[PDB]
Symmetry: C2
Subunit: 250 residues, 2 copies
């Protein structure tokens, strides 16, 4: 009655799973909790458990090696893979977004760029999340101290959002997508016995959520409000990640 | 000496005075305080005290007659002129803007129009004042209940206005034009003795104000604040209209 095979089919059906990215999630998750590097054979059993070929893992590791995402050691006949220093710092920068408790009822603001600045959104710090609603105006989230003084900063009125705004925020804030992932995730009923099954399921549930949470806009999320699909979806993922727990591969 | 001649030269220097409009101000002002119609000879003495020809007044009255702004009676040898019913109702619609105490520190908001609506500002009621700051965004004034539900309504944050916004409002809210008119008005030292002088000065001070007020954006002004020029300039115009008082054109 295997929980892995149907979950894989389901995730692939919404958006095909790119092995290199699944590997980045896997390596990222283990390094966050102490396992700085995973053996090639241990990694290979995870890739096989998923329904994939060890050949596919080699082509994924070659892609990631050349692109500076992964680093490799050879101690005798065993290969050891880990995220690169570049990849780890980038991974750590999104830890709170992925593993954290979430923004909850986060407030939003509207920011208007000066006339001289066409690509004004690039001038906005990494700490700020911005969803354009017009050529010069965007819905913003984050530290308002990071909003430059030459931008027009304006706050929400008691009024709701006009339909044209709600249409933008529903799309950028992945309301349909978080609902769809939660509905797919609802299928998982029991925790598997095997340490490998528990590990493969955790990486799959984590990858599905990682790929979405990092695609969605926190600004657009804050604009959707407390009833947003991201709340209930995060609620299930972090419950699932707790009931599956953390597995050191063997 | 004479306070009329320099004031005329000063007003003409900023923007040449159009006689037909000066007449519309005059007739509108008298209708406000009871004088339903002014005689042609009384009107002619006002036009002359200004430094103009009676011929110029006839061409101005002909323009206003055909255009339905003024109506004329001929009781014997005397002609009687008044604003037409449509001119009066249009005049009365702006009474509060001209004669009123002003909006003071009136609040502003930012309104964003939907993508499908290009001429969104036309869809905004007469009760709302709007100053565009972008193609789809404008600073608004007035009853928020009149702001359509398909517009993005956003309020001021504790932060000030960026320089690019201040530049719009300084222009739109006639900051410099209000400064100049107030300085121009400082020359008016004492109230003249003559009923005619008192009358001509009142119409001139009122016209200069009327033109600039109906041109300035109430929303732009609301964004400018309580230290804006429209406030002090308004108090000066009202102070003068009070110290000059109201004169019946008997002459």
């Amino acid at each position: 009655s295997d929980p892995i095979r149907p979950l894989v089919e389901a995730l692939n059906a919404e958006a095909p799973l790119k092995l290199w990215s699944v590997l980045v999630t896997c390596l990222g998750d283990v390094s966050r909790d102490g396992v700085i590097e995973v053996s090639g054979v241990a990694l290979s059993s995870f890739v096989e458990r998923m329904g994939l070929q060890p050949q596919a893992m080699r082509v994924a590791l070659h892609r990631l090696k050349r692109d500076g995402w992964v680093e490799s050691r050879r101690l005798g006949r065993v290969g050891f893979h880990r995220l690169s220093d570049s990849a780890l710092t980038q991974t750590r920068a999104v830890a709170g977004r992925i593993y954290g408790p979430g923004a909850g009822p986060a407030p939003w603001h509207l920011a208007g760029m000066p006339p001289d600045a066409p690509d004004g959104l690039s001038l906005l710090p990494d700490t700020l999340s911005a969803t354009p609603i017009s050529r010069r105006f965007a819905l913003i989230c984050g530290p308002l101290e990071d909003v430059p003084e030459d931008w027009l900063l304006t706050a929400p009125s008691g009024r709701g959002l006009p339909v044209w705004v709600q249409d933008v925020v529903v799309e950028a804030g992945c309301e349909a997508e978080f609902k769809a992932l939660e509905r797919t995730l609802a299928q998982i009923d029991k925790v598997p016995d095997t340490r490998l099954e528990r590990f493969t399921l955790r990486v799959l549930v984590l990858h599905a959520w990682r790929r979405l949470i990092l695609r969605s806009s926190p600004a657009a999320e804050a604009a959707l409000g407390g009833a947003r699909a991201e709340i209930s979806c995060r609620a299930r993922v972090h419950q699932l990640l707790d009931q599956l727990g953390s597995v050191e591969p063997d």
